[PDB]
CSV table of C-alpha atoms and ligand atoms in Angstrom, one decimal:
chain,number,residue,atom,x,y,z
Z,1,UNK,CA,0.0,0.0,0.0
Z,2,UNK,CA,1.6,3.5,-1.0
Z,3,UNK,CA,0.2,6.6,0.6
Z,4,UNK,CA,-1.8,5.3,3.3
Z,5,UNK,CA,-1.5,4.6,6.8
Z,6,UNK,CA,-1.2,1.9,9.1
Z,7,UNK,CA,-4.7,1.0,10.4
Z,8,UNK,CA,-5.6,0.3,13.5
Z,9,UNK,CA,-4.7,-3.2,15.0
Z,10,UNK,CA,-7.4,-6.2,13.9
Z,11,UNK,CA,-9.9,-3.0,12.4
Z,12,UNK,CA,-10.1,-5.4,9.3
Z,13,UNK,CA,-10.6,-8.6,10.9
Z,14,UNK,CA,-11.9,-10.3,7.9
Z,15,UNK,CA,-8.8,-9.7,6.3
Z,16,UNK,CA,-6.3,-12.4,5.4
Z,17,UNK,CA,-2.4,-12.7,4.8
Z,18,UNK,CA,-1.7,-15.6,2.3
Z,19,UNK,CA,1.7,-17.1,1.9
Z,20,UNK,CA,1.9,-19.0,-1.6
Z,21,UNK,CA,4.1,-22.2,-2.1
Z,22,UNK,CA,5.8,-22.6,-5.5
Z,23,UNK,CA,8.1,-25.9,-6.3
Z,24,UNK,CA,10.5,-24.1,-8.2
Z,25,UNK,CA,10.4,-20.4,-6.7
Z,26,UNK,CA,10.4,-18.8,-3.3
Z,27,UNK,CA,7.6,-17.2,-1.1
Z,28,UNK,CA,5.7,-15.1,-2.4
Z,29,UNK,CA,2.7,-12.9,-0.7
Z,30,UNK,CA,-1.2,-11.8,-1.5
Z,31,UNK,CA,-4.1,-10.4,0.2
Z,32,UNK,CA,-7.0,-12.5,0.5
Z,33,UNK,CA,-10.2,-12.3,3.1
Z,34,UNK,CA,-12.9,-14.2,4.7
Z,35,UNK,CA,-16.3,-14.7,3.3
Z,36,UNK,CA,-17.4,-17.5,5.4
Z,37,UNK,CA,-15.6,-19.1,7.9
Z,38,UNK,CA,-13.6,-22.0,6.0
Z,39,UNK,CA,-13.6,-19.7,2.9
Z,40,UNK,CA,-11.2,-17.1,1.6
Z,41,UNK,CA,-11.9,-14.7,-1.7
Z,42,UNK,CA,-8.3,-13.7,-3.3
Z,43,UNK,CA,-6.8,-13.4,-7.2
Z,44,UNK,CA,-6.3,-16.2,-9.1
Z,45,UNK,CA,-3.1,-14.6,-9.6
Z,46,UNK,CA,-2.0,-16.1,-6.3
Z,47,UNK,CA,-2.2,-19.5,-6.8
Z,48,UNK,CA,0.2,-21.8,-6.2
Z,49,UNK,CA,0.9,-25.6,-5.2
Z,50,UNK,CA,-0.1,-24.8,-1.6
Z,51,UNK,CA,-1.4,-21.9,0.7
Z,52,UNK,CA,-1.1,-21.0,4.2
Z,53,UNK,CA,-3.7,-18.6,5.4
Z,54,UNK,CA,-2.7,-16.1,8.4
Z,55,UNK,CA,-6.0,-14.5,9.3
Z,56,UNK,CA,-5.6,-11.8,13.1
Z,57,UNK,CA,-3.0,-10.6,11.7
Z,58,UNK,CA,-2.0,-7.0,12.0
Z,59,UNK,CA,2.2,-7.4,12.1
Z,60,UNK,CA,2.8,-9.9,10.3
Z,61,UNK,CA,6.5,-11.0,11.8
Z,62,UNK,CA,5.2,-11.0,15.8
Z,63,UNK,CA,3.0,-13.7,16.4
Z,64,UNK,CA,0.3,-12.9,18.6
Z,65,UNK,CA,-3.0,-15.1,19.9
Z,66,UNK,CA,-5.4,-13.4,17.7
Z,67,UNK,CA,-3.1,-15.1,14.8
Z,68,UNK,CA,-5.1,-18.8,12.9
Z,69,UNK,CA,-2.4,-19.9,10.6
Z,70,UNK,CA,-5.1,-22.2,8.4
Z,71,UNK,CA,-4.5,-25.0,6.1
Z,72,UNK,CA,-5.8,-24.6,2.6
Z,73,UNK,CA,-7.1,-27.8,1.3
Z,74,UNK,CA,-8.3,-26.8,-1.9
Z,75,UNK,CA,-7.7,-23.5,-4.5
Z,76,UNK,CA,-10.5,-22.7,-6.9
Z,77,UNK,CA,-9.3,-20.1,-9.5
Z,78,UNK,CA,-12.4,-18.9,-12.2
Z,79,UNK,CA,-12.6,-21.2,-14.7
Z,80,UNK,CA,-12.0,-18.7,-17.4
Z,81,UNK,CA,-9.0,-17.3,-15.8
Z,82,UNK,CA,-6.5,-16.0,-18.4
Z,83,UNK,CA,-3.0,-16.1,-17.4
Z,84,UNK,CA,-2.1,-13.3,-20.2
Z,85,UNK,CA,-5.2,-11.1,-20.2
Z,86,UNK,CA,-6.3,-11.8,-16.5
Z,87,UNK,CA,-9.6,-11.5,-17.3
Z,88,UNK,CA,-11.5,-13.5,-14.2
Z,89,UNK,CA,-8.5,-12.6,-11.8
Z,90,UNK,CA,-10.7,-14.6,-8.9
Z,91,UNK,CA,-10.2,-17.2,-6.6
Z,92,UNK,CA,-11.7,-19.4,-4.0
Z,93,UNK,CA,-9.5,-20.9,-1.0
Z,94,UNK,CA,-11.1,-23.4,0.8
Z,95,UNK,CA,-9.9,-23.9,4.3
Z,96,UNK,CA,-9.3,-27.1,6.3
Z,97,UNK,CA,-11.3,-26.2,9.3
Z,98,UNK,CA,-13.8,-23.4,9.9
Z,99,UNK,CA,-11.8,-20.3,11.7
Z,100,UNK,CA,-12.9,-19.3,15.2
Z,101,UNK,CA,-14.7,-16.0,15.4
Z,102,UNK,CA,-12.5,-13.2,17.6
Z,103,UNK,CA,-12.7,-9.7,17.9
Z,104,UNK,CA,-9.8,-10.1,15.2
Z,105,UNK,CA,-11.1,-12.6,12.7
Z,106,UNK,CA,-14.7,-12.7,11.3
Z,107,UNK,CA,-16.3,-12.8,7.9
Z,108,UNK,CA,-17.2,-10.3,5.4
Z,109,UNK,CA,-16.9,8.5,-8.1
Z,110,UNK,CA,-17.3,7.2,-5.1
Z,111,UNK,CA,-13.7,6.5,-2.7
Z,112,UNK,CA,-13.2,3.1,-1.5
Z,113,UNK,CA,-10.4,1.6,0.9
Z,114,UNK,CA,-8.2,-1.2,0.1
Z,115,UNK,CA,-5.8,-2.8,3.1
Z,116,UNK,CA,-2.9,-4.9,2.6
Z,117,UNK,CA,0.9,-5.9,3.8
Z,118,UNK,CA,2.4,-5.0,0.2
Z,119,UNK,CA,5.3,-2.4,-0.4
Z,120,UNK,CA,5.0,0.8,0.4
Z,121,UNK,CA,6.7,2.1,-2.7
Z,122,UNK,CA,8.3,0.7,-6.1
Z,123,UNK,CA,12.0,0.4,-4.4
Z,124,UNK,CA,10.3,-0.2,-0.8
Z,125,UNK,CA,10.0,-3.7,0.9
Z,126,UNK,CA,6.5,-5.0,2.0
Z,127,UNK,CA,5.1,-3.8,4.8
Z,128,UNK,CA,5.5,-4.9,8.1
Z,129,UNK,CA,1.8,-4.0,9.5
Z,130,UNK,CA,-1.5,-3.8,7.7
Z,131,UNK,CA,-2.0,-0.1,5.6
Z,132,UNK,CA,-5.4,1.2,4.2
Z,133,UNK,CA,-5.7,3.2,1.7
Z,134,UNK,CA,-8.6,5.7,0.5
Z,135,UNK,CA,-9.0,5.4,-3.6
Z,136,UNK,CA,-11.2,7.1,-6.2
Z,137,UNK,CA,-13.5,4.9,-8.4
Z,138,UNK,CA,-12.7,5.6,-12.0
Z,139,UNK,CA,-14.5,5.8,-15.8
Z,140,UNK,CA,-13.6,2.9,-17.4
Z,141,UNK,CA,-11.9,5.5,-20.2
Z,142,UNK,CA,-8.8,6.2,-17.1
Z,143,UNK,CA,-7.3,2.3,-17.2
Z,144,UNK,CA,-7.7,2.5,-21.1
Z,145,UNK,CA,-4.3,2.1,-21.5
Z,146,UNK,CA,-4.4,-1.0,-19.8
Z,147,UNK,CA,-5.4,-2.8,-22.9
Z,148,UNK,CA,-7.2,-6.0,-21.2
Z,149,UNK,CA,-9.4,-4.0,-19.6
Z,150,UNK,CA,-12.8,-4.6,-19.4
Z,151,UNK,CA,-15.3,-2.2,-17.3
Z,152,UNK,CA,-17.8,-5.1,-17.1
Z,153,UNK,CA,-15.5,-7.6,-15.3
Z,154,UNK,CA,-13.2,-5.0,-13.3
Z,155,UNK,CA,-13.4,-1.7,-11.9
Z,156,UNK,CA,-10.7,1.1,-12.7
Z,157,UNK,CA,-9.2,2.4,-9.3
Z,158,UNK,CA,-6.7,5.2,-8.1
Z,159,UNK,CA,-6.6,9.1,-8.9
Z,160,UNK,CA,-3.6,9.1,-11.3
Z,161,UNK,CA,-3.1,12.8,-9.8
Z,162,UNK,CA,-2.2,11.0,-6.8
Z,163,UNK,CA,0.1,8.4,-5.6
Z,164,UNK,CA,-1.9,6.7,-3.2
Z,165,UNK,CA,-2.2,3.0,-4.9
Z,166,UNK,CA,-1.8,-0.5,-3.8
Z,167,UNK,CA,1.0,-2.2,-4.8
Z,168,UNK,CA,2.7,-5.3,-5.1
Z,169,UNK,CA,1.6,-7.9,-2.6
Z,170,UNK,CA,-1.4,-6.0,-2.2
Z,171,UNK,CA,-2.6,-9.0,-4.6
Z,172,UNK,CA,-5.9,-10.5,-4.0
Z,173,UNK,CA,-7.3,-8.2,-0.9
Z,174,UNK,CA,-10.7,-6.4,-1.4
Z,175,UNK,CA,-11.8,-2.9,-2.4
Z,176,UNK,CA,-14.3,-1.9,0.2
Z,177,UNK,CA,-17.2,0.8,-0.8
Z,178,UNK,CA,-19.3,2.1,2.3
Z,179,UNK,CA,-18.7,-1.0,3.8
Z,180,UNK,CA,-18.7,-3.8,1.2
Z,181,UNK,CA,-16.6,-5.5,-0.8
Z,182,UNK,CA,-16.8,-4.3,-4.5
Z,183,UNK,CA,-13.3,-5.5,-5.9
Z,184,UNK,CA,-10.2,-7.4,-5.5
Z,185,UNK,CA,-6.7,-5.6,-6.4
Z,186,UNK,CA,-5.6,-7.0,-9.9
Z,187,UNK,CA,-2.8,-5.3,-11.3
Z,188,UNK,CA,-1.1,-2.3,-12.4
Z,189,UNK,CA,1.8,-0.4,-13.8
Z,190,UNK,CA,5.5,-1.4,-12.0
Z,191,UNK,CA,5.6,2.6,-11.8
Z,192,UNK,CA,2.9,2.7,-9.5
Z,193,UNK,CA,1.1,5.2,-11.5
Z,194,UNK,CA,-2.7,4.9,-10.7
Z,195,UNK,CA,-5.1,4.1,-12.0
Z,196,UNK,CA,-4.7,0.4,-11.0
Z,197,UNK,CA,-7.1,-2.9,-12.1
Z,198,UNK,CA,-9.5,-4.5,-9.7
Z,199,UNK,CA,-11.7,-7.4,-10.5
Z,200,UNK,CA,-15.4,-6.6,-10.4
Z,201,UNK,CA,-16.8,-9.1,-7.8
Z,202,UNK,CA,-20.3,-8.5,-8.6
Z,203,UNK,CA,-20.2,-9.8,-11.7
Z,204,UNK,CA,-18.9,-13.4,-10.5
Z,205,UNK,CA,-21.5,-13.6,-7.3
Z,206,UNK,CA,-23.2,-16.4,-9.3
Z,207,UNK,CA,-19.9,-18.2,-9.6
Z,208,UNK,CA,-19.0,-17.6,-5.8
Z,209,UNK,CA,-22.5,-19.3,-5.2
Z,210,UNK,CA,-22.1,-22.2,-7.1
Z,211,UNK,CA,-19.0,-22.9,-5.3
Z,212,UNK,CA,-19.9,-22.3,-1.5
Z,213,UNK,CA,-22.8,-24.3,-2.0
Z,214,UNK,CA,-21.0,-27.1,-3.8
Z,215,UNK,CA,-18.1,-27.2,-0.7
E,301,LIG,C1,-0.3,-5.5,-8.2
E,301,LIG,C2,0.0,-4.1,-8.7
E,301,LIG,C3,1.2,-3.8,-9.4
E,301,LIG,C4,2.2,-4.9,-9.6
E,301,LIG,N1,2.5,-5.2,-11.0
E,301,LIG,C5,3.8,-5.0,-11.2
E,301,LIG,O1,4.5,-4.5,-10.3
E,301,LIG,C6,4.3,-5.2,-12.5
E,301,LIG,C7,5.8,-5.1,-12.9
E,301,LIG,O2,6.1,-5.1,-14.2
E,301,LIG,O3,6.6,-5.1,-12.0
E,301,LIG,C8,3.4,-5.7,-13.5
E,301,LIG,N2,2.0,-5.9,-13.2
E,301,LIG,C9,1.2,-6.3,-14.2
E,301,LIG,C10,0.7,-5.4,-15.1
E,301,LIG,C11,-0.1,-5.8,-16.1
E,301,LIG,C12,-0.4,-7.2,-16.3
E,301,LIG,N3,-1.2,-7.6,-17.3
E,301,LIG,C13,-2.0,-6.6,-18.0
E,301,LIG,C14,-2.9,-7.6,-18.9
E,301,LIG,N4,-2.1,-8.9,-18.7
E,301,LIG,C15,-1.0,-8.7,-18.0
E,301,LIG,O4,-0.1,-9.5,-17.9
E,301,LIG,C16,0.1,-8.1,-15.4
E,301,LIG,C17,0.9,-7.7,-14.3
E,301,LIG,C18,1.6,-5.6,-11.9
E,301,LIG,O5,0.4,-5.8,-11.6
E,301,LIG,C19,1.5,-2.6,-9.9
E,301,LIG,C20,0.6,-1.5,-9.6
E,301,LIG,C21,-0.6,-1.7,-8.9
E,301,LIG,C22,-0.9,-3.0,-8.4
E,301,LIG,C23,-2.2,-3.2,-7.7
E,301,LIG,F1,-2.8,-2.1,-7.6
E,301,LIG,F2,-2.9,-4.1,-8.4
E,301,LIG,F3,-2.0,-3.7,-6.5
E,302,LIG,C1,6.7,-5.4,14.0
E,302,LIG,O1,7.4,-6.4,14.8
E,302,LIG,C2,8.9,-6.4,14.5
E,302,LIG,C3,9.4,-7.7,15.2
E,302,LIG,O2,9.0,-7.8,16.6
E,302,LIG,C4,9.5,-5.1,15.0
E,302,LIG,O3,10.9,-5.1,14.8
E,302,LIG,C5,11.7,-4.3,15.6
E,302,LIG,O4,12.0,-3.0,15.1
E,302,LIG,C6,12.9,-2.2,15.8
E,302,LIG,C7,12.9,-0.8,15.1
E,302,LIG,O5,11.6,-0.3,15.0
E,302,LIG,C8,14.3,-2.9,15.8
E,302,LIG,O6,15.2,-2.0,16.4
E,302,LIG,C9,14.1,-4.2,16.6
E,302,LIG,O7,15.4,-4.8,16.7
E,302,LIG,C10,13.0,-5.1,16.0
E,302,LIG,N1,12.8,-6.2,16.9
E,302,LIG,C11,12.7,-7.4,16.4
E,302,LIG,C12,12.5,-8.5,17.5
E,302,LIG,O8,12.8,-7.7,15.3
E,302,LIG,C13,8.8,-4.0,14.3
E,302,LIG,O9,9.3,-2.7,14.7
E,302,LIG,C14,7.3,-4.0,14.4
E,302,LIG,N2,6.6,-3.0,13.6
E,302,LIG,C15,5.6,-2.3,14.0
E,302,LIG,C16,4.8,-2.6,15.2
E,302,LIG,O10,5.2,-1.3,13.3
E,303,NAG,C1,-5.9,-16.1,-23.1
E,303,NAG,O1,-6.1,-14.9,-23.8
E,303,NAG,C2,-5.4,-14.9,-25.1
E,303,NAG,C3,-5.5,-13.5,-25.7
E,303,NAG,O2,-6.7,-12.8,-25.4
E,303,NAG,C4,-6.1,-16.0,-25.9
E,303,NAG,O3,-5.7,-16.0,-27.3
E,303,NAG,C5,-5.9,-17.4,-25.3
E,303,NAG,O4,-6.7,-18.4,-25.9
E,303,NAG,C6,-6.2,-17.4,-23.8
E,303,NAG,N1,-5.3,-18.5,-23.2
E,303,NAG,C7,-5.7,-19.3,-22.2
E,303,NAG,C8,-4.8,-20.4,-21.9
E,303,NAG,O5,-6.7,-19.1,-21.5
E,304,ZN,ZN1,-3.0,-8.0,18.2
């Protein structure tokens, strides 16, 4: 997250901190959160050959009792996902068990807020605690430039007269609008020039549906 602030300890307790598994590369590090209680929404972007889960997390390196480190037993990325356009950038984790409920873990033109433990600038490392950001909703006509998009599967988000953006491992967490969850962060430019590319959840509600109630 660039341009924001560190938010207040557990303020975002349906958010999760996902650790991806690859068999040929290091760590690497999304966003995610929790819809129901052995279910996490993130990008299909950040699969991998396994997933740890972190949800209570606010620093990420000082483990603390609010902190559920969950098994992932199962990753379901959109169907129609497209590695080079990422058109249906959306994914379901399944977790092992059902999380507890805790103060600091439950489920879940116009300016929105997007939290996450990415970098806090291009040449900046990811950040320790969990940031929130404030970000303009766009026209579809600002993220033209972004070729692949497409205004009825994402939405276009970030001022590009300001710096404030997420950022890399900002990946997968949601785009909150008066409360709910409208997107999840996509991509963007390695500049970090907003705007940036969110997927449009409401268009794959029916495909989050079929899955819960299949699992
Ligand atoms: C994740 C992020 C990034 C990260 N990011 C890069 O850093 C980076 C680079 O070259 O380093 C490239 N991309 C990127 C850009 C474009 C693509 N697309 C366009 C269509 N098909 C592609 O392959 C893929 C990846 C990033 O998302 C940048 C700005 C904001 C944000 C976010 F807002 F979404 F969080
Ligand atoms: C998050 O937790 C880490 C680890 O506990 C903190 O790291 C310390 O940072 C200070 C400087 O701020 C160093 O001098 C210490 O040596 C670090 N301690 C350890 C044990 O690593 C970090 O500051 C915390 N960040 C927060 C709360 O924002
Ligand atoms: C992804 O998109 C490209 C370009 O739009 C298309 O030609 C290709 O069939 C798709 N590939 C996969 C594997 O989904
Ligand atoms: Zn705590």
């Amino acid at each position: 997250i660039i341009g924001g602030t560190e938010c207040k300890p557990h303020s975002r307790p349906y958010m999760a901190y996902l650790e991806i598994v690859t068999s040929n590369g290091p760590s690497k590090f999304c966003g995610g959160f929790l819809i129901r209680r052995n279910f996490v929404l993130t990008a299909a972007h950040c699969a991998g050959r396994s997933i740890t889960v972190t949800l209570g997390a606010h620093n990420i390196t000082e483990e603390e009792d609010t902190w559920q480190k969950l098994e992932v037993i199962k990753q379901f990325r959109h169907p129609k996902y497209n590695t080079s356009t990422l058109h249906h950038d959306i994914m379901l984790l399944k977790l092992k068990e059902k999380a507890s409920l805790t103060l600091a873990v439950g489920t879940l033109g116009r300016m929105c807020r997007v939290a996450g433990w990415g970098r806090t600038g291009v040449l900046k490392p990811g950040s320790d605690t969990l940031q929130e950001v404030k970000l303009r909703l766009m026209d579809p006509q600002a993220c033209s430039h972004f070729r692949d998009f497409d205004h009825n599967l994402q939405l276009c988000v970030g001022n590009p007269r300001k710096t404030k953006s997420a950022f890399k491992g900002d990946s997968g967490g949601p785009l909150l609008c008066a409360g709910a969850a409208q997107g999840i962060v996509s991509y963007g430019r390695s500049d970090a020039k907003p705007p940036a590319v969110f997927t449009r959840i409401s268009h794959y509600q029916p495909w989050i549906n079929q899955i819960l109630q299949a699992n």
